[PDB]
């Protein structure tokens, strides 16, 4: 069993799910026509695809993923591109007008528009699940449908399903560079409502992956596609324990118990250790102890924040490939003997480990090199609170004059939720201050 | 090599690349179905 349902909402969600599902078809034998090649075996064969693919009576496989957007443009290259025959037609839901970088458009007028259809499609996709682990949400904080419609979607998902695991993946607002100018409003309003409804919110941002592709990979001028490929590698490493044999398995429920200590601190940061080019793999080892240390390097983080500016509350190391557990234990033991890496008092253990045997695959035309070992690091740190300070300052700069608000109050939203969301984020900042103080 | 089965007398096959698992123990209408296995780890 062990089925997972992916929900890609927004332009960022769809362009991430393209890379993710190309990857998923590459781990197994699934081709873009929707079928494997021919039988190769008398009678039964592999069934590792049941994590993500539902298979009909003939040999065709359908992804367990709902693609949602309010704009028809981004989804239509999936309907006409290479993977048009793989997806069920009713699995790609579009609107006619988008949210136009407006939270209330995506939550009150066009959000409640299409939320019933995707809920029905989720019900139909969850009816094929003999054993269902949890839902995966891919969205961006700066969007209108990635912020408004995702919030309402997880809201009604918590209403209709109860305590099903909702691991969400977010593209955080970068500190310096940004696209929209109403982006802090959307981030504030999408944190205020999903502060509870998300079980654990795995987060990345575009600027840190830009820096990674600049320094680690040897590509000047990366685009969104390389970022989507790295995010897809992270998601493949996260769920690899449900599909491949390993020495220490991990389910989707274990992340929320080993990473979320308190009912509001559920924003860990992702890291991928051996992201190096093929021109630099010729020279160096990729050993367990060498690339375990590369996870805790500040320059290799996938969120533009300094781990030296806070304390590590918990970690979730997801090893992958030819990893010897003795080297894992030695590397994690020698991590704790450093003063640059500091841990909180009330977590003497700190680490949750996982070992998988299947090495990462090679996407043709990709950037990463073929390696035997890979680490996906999930760190919950107090150093995220300096990003909330910057976000709060960005909201308070243009909330003092109340700019770009007539697009929100005028259309289907009162004004009091702005003040309420500011109170909620300020309370979260004080909580992050409280949990970082040592009980000496 | 006909060695005794003692702690340490095991040597892994490093040329093996596929590590896929099957769903031998699945489900049905309401019943914990159990299937006889036909493939090992990797699909062989």
């Amino acid at each position: 069993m062990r089925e997972c349902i992916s929900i890609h909402v927004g332009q960022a969600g769809v362009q991430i799910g393209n890379a993710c599902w190309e990857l998923y078809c590459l781990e197994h034998g699934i081709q873009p026509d929707g079928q494997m090649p021919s039988d190769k075996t008398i009678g039964g064969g592999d069934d590792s695809f049941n994590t993500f693919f539902s298979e009909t009576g003939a040999g065709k496989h359908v992804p367990r993923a709902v693609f949602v957007d309010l704009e028809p443009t981004v989804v239509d290259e999936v309907r006409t591109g290479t993977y048009r025959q793989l997806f069920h037609p009713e699995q790609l839901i579009t609107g006619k007008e988008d949210a136009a970088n407006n939270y209330a458009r995506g939550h009150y007028t066009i959000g409640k528009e299409i939320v019933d259809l995707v809920l029905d499609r989720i019900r139909k996709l969850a009816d094929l699940c003999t054993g269902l682990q949890g839902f995966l949400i891919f969205h961006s904080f700066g969007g209108g449908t990635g912020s408004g419609f995702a919030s309402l979607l997880m809201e009604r998902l918590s209403v209709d399903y109860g305590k099903k695991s909702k691991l969400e993946f977010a593209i955080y607002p970068a500190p310096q560079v940004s696209t929209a100018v109403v982006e802090p409003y959307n981030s504030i309003l999408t944190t205020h409502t999903t502060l509870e409804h998300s079980d654990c919110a795995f987060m990345v941002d575009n600027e840190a992956i830009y820096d990674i592709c600049r320094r680690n990979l040897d590509i000047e001028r990366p685009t969104y596609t390389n970022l989507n490929r790295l995010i897809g590698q992270i998601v493949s490493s996260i769920t690899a324990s449900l599909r491949f044999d390993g020495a220490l398995n991990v389910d989707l429920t274990e992340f929320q118990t080993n990473l979320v200590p308190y009912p509001r601190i559920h924003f860990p940061l992702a890291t991928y250790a051996p992201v190096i080019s093929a021109e630099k793999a010729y020279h160096e080892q990729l050993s367990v102890a060498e690339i375990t240390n590369a996870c805790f390097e500040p320059a290799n983080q996938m969120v533009k924040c300094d781990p030296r500016h806070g304390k590590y509350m918990a970690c979730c190391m997801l090893y992958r490939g030819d990893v010897v557990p003795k080297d894992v234990n030695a590397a994690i033991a020698t991590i704790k003997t450093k003063r640059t890496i500091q841990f909180v008092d009330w977590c003497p253990t700190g680490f949750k480990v996982g070992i998988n045997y299947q090495p990462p695959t090679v996407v043709p035309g990709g950037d990463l090199a073929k390696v035997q070992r890979a680490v996906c690091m999930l760190s919950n740190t107090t150093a995220i609170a300096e990003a909330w300070a910057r976000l709060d300052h960005k909201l308070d700069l243009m909330y003092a004059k109340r700019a770009f608000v007539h697009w929100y109050v005028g259309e289907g939203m009162e004004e009091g939720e702005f003040s309420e969301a500011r109170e909620d984020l300020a309370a979260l900042e004080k909580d992050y201050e409280e949990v970082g103080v040592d009980s000496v | 090599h006909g060695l005794p089965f003692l702690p340490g007398t095991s040597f892994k096959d490093l040329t093996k690349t596929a590590f896929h698992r099957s769903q031998t123990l699945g489900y049905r209408n309401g019943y914990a179905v159990v299937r006889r296995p036909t493939v090992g780890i990797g699909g062989d």
């Binding site: 362009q15 393209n18 890379a19 190309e22 590459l26 873009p32 290259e77 006409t80 591109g81 290479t82 993977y83 685009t223 969104y224 596609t225 989507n228 090679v362 043709p364 035309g365 073929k370 | 040329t15 690349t17």
Partner: peptide, 24 residues
Amino acid sequence: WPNWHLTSSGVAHHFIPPVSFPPP
């Protein structure tokens, strides 16, 4: 399909056949 060289998603996501890894 002329989108192999006209759009970003086409050059990014088009099918190149995978190669069998381990040499004989």
